[PDB]
Amino acid sequence: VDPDIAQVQVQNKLQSATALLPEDVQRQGVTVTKSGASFLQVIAFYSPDNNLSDSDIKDYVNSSIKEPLSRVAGVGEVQVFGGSYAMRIWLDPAKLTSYQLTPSDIATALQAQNSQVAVGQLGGAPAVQGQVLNATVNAQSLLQTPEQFKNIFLKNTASGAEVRLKDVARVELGSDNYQFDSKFNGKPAAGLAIKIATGANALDTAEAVEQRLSELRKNYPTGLADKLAYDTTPFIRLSI
Amino acid sequence: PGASAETVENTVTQIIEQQMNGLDGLRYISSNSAGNGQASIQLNFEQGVDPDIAQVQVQNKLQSATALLPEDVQRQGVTVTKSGASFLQVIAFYSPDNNLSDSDIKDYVNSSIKEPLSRVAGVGEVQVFGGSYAMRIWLDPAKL
Amino acid sequence: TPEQFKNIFLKNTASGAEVRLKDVARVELGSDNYQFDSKFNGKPAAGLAIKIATGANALDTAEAVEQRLSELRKNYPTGLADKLAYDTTPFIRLSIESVVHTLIEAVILVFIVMFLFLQNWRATIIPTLAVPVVVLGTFAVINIFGFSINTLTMFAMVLAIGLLVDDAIVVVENVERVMSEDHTDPVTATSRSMQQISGALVGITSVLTAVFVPMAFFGGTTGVIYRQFSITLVTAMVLS
Amino acid sequence: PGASAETVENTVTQIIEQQMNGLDGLRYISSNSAGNGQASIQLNFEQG
Amino acid sequence: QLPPNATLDRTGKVIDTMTNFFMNEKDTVESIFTVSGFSFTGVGQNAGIGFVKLKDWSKRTTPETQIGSLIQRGMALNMIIKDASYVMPLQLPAMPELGVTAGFNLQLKDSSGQGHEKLIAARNTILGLASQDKRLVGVRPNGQEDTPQYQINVDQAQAGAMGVSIAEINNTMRIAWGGSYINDFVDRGRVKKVYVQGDAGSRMMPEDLNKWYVRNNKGEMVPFSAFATGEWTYGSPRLERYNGVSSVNIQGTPAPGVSSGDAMKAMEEIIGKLPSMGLQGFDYEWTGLSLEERESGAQAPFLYALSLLIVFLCLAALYESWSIPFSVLLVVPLGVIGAIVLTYLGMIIKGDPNLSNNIYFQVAIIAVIGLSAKNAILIVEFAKELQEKGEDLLDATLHAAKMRLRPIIMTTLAFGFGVLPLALSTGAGAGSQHSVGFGVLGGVLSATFLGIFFIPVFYVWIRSIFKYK
Amino acid sequence: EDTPQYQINVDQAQAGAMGVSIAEINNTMRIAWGGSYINDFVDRGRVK
Amino acid sequence: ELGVTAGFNLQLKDSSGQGHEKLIAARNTILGLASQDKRLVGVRPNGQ
Ligand SMILES: CCN(CC)[C@@H]1C(O)=C(C(N)=O)C(=O)[C@@]2(O)C(O)=C3C(=O)c4c(O)cc([C@@H]5CCCN5)c(C(F)(F)F)c4C[C@H]3C[C@@H]12
């Protein structure tokens, strides 16, 4: 049975169950993948001097190394075990009771505040006679920093005082998942796996990855090293 | 929507673009990110590649990529089309004696002459250069 | 109707006055899209641009488009007319027809060369009769393998006329000489002539088929062009 | 569910058939909208 | 193309000056269809396109009524219409499937990562250098150009205090300044759309924002002015990427007497000056038809070599020798000389950029090799037979040449008369026909006047070195 | 293998006297103990 | 695969948007003349 045809049939059937899925599940997104090539090699990105945390490196591989490695010839797929940062708000139950607030209120204040405004264009299509200029109106309204998140408005006290997010919660940039601890050699670590592409020489793809990696090490954050935790190329070279 | 050419690029463009790097038979990729919020990615395959099967492949790569898209982008939908290079024909509809108006002409080509031709054998794409009647409500800010 | 949208009820004010849609807005039947202004000969017009599907004959698609339009015109409103502003199909036909004119011209010119050398109607006719069989047969073989009639296939047929008459010419040139030397009958000479002529016949065919065979193997767009010439040429030479 | 045939034609069937263009091999499209709330659009393709 | 931030109305004024010109070129022009707001490169109020249908090829025989004559006169539009950035008339590609317009397409890649500004600086050096090369016509950036934008900044803090949601402001401002499709009505049995948007006077200028109000949680009306402010900014309307790297597309056309390859080589030389001038770290790639041009020229040396080899090996198997296949191979240059010579002279005399090394020329050379080989086999096969029958080599070679001459000339001349029609074609498709014809015809002529003499001589030489039996 | 787990048991009637609504109780806990993903934000050009 | 039952199938199609009651009116006129014509036998409306 042709693999591609099987995957597309499944995704198409999947389109008929999504409305019936819980909003939250839908929000994360549901993925369909297929069986295929084995991993040629896994590279472990680790901090020898304990300078960087796991969250930090998984984020670095994700924002930096994943895409340059994908364009390397022969690489069908690049997978990273890991994820980036998330903004985290941890709430004191007591501090909330003090100001008559409930977790839901904090949620409502966080949906409104963190939004992207969309406006339109100055000229406009059915424009007035004698319009000379058309431009684009854009509004920057999203929040990017932790401090912006802590100043978010919640309520005004009877005294007229201001209760913001900082008052009832601790706001930090933190990990997306706390479920897994990954290390290489007792040191914080993250892992990236390479899958060879169809109709390819692994021996040659492997050499190409090595050379791309060579260029990216120069721009590494302080304290990062890269080494191989898995390699299958020695087997194949030896067998030939 | 509401995003700059630079956010459309890092958020949507490059993320979609990296998923499609390992596709079989891909000659080259060209991409565009625009200030209106629109992103476009064109993929060119090598002679020999069946177009029907290549379409099923891109779509299979995109199901995982859509997750990593921002939520407002997923909400607006992501479109995958087999694409052509040049128009074979451009047909003009017009009034000689001006006994018919353009809004009327444009409506008749969108309601009566477009779908049948788009469904003519071998046709593929059909673009319209006029519009269709719509109910337009134009608000006064003051009176509101 | 737009009146029903003007009577939409919105609110009541404190006085108790009803606020309907007309009060806050103007309602009109307008347009879905206000983006483009299209004109034909400087006058208002609408247009339909058609981009053909992959894997299809432009000529055939064009006829179908027009045939559907023939049925559509009967139900047209009184003012409507339609013309083709941009059509590429006419050149394509004129290009196809030009080459067929060239083919006919070449056959006539080759006949004359042969007549100038052969000098007998009887001698000249035999090589000439080969041309209908070789060309008709090649067209047949090529359609078994899915090659259409196009400029490239047709250029190859024109290139082949001087080439496919060679075996025939090398046969009758000799029978004719044999006879003027030995004064033998048409059948005796032909059998003798055929013994001396055969080594040459196989050799000429072999060279002429082998030069054109490596082209078909080359891939890419250039390969698609090369294989039109090589299937036609190779088929023609074996047939000859 | 609960819909009139007219409501299924306006709200459901027409919206869908409008997106049904650009299909390789399409001989014809036939559709039905009914009082039991159901719409069926059948698409017939040419041989091969 | 018009200047940045242009209105649809300003674009329609230019398309009218353009349409008047074509509608007045009566001898060569039948019709025009125009769309303002649409372009292949992008949709914007500034963009525009026109489809011009010329008169029947029959009615256009004079030089003035030719296609390039039209294009050159229409290139005066750039100078006439001051407002527009560019007004460029462009021919279709030979195979329109492979492109929109003929010419060259290139991508300048920022391989180093220097910038977007740096990249545009490079484009503009390349643009002015290309203006000053006489082998080039109409070099232009393809794509949108940097435009002034209007940036609105909303103070989140004051928004929180007045009590207006940033999410709500978006709702009020998305429906007001842009449109919103809400629901559907039926017109004549067909569902249409209902749109809500503000009136044109309200959405025209930055000051018009002040006319709109947003309701707070207390239910009051708060001016847009209270929570936001606007500044005019400058930026890129659209960013382009080629193969994972940021790029710019540059498209142009060869000048009237120059070939496509020559224009391509001129551009690459210009890019070479980029480092010396001071912008370094820039790379380029070819795309579209130009990519393909590059690739086809490349495959030709391998094609010629492989074809020569198959002939050589087949001859050995057929004739059980190694020496004789070499004698037939040696005569091959004689035919190929005429082919290149007619093409080059022809181009010079005829003034034709089309008569050059192209795919059609390559098919012709293959044909010439087969012709030369065929001519050589006829003399040589017969010679070996006589030698095998006891004749001494010189006598046998000489006898063969006389016996096989009339046959050889007659066949060679018929291949020549066959391609004379291709060579002298005046109709649609003539350029392709000529490319094949001249190459084949030249080879015929050289083979007949030089190759025939050389076939006996090389055979004698090889056979003397390696004696039969 | 099966493992020990913990069940909260909410009395609607005690809550009713208090005034509290069931879905309010349910919502509190989902966010408090469970956690919630509200919306995306941009940091360094990547949406998180 | 074929439910036609060896009967000519005619799809009276309202292409001018006259309406359903007008489409039915047209059908009624067509079915009258058909019954009258000797060549045509058993021409029946298919739906409801
Ligand atoms: C994002 C959270 N999490 C991140 C921790 C991952 C995630 O949860 C997903 C999912 N649900 O999709 C998974 O894939 C995962 O669960 C999984 O399957 C793993 C493995 O099995 C695995 C392996 O087989 C071999 C190696 C290599 C081979 C050579 C040396 N060791 C490694 C490696 F060490 F590199 F990390 C792993 C890691 C996890 C990742 C999980």
* Ramachandran class of A50: left when φ > 0, alpha when ψ lies in -120 to 50, beta otherwise: left
* Alpha-carbon distances, residue C235 vs B64, C231, D11, E419 (angstroms): 50, 6, 60, 19
- N- to C-terminal Cα distance for chain E? 79
Amino acid (one-letter) located at E186: V
Note whether E231 and E222 are within 8 A (CB).
no
Residues of B in contact with D44 (CB under 8 A): none
B74 touches chain F (CB under 8 A): no
Report angle CA A8, A14, A18 to the nearest 5 degrees: 145
Question: F with G: 3 or more CB pairs under 8 Å?
Answer: no
String of DSSP letters for B16-36? HHHHTTT-TTEEEEEEEEETT
Task: Report the Cα C185 to chain-centroid distance in Å.
Answer: 48
Q: Measured between alpha carbons, how far is E416 from E434 in angstroms, rounded to an integer?
A: 13
CA of B43 to the centre of ligand 1 (A): 31
β-strand E238-242 against F42-43: which pairing, if any? unpaired
Q: How many angstroms is the resolution?
A: 2.9
Single out the residue of E275, E298, E278 nearest to residue E286, CA to CA: E298
Q: Give pairs for A216-222: CB < 8 Å, separation 24+.
A: A216/A64, A216/A65, A216/A68, A219/A64, A221/A52, A221/A56, A221/A60, A222/A51
Is residue D8 within 8 A of residue D38, CB to CB? The reply is: yes
Q: Search chain B and give the residue with CA nearest A15.
A: B63
- Closest-CA distance of chain C to residue D17, Å: 19
Residues in chain A: 240
d(CA G31, CA G12): 11
Q: Which residues pair with E239 in a beta bridge?
A: B33
End-to-end CA distance of chain B: 26
**E23 CB contacts (<8 Å, ≥6 apart)?**
C41, C42, E29, E32
Token pair listed for E190:
């067909």
> How many angstroms separate the CA atoms of C75 and C64, rounded?
18
Q: For residues B87 and C48, what is the distance between their CA atoms, to the nearest angstrom? A: 10
Distance CA E233, CA G16 (A): 52
| CA dist C158 → C107, E393, E420, E432 (Å) | 9, 39, 10, 13
Residues, chain C, total?
240
Q: Tell me how crowded residue C135 is: count the other CB atoms within 10 A of its CB.
A: 19
Asked if residues A154 and A109 have their Cβ atoms less than 8 Å apart, the reply is: yes
CB-CB neighbors (< 8 A) of B30 in chain E: 107, 240-242, 287
Residue C188's identity, in one-letter code, is T
Ligand 1 mutation pick, A35, A54, A81, max ligand atoms within 8 A of CB: A81
Please compute Rg for chain C using Cα positions. Answer: 34
- Contact yes or no for A146/A161 (Cβ under 8 A): no
Whether D contacts A, i.e. 3 or more CB pairs less than 8 A apart, is no
With a 6 Å cutoff on the Cβ, whether A82 touches ligand 1 is: yes
Whether E81 and E17 have beta carbons less than 8 Å apart is answered as: yes
G33 by DSSP, 3-state: which?
helix
Phi, psi of E163 (to 5 degrees): 100, 25
* Distance from the alpha carbon of residue A230 to the mean position of ligand 1, in angstroms: 13
Q: Do the Cβ atoms of E344 and E353 come closer than 8 Å?
A: no
Which atom of ligand 1 sits closest to the CA of residue A182? Answer: 5
Considering CB atoms only, which of E152, E166, E169 is closest to A138?
Answer: E152
3-state secondary structure at position G21: helix
Interface of chain E against chain D, CB under 8 Å? 184, 186, 190-191
Q: Name the strand (E) or helix (H) holding E329.
A: helix E323-330
CA distance C112 to C119: 10
Could you give the count of Cα atoms lying within 13 Å of A119 in the half-sphere of its Cβ? 32
Ligand 1 centroid, distance to F8 Cα (angstroms): 34
Longest dimension (CA), chain G: 34
List the structure tokens of B12: 């949507």
Residue type at position E103: G
Answer for the pair E149, A135: CB distance below 8 angstroms, yes or no.
yes
Name the structure determination technique.
cryo-EM
**Chain C residue at shortest CA distance from E296:** C222
Let me know if E149 is exposed, middle or buried by CB neighbors in 10 A (0-12, 13-18, 19+).
Answer: buried
Q: Please, are residues C99 and C151 in contact by the beta-carbon 8 Å criterion?
A: yes
Interior angle at CA B65, CA B76 and CA A27, nearest 5 = 55
Chains in contact with D via at least 3 Cβ–Cβ pairs below 8 Å: B, C, E
Pairing verdict, β C37-40 and E29-36? antiparallel
Shortest distance between the Cα of B37 and any Cα of chain F, in A, equals: 15
Which protein residue's CA is at the shortest distance from atom 10 of ligand 1? A81
Distance CA E355, CA D12 (A): 60
Alpha helices in chain C (DSSP H): 2-6, 21-24, 58-73, 89-118, 121-144, 151-164, 166-182, 186-210, 214-217, 220-239
Distance A80 CA to ligand 1 centre (A): 8
Q: Is A176 in the pocket of ligand 1 (CB under 6 A)?
A: no
Q: What span, in angstroms and rounded, lies between the C-alpha atoms of E412 and E405?
A: 10
**For residue B98, is it left (φ>0), alpha (ψ between -120 and 50) or beta?**
left
Tell me how far apart the alpha carbons of residues E410 and E433 are, in angstroms, rounded to a whole number: 24
Taking a C-beta distance cutoff of 8 angstroms, is the pair E126, E248 a contact?
no
Cα(B112)–Cα(B133) distance, rounded to whole angstroms? 13
Residue with tokens 């098919």: E363
Number of C/E CB contacts below 8 angstroms equals: 210
Using alpha carbons, select from A145, A151, A147, A153 the residue that is nearest to residue A105: A153
DSSP-assigned letters across all residues of E405-424: HHHHHHHHHHHHHHHHHHHT
Question: What is the CA(A81)–ligand 1 centre distance, in A?
Answer: 5
Token couple for A24 = 């939250």
How many beta-carbon contacts under 8 Å exist across B and D? 17
Alpha-carbon span E236 to E242, nearest angstrom = 17
Nearest to A134 by CA among B35, E205, E237: E205
- Spatial contact of E372 and E332, defined as CB atoms under 8 Å apart: yes
Please name the residue of chain D whose CA is at the shortest distance from the CA of residue E185: D10
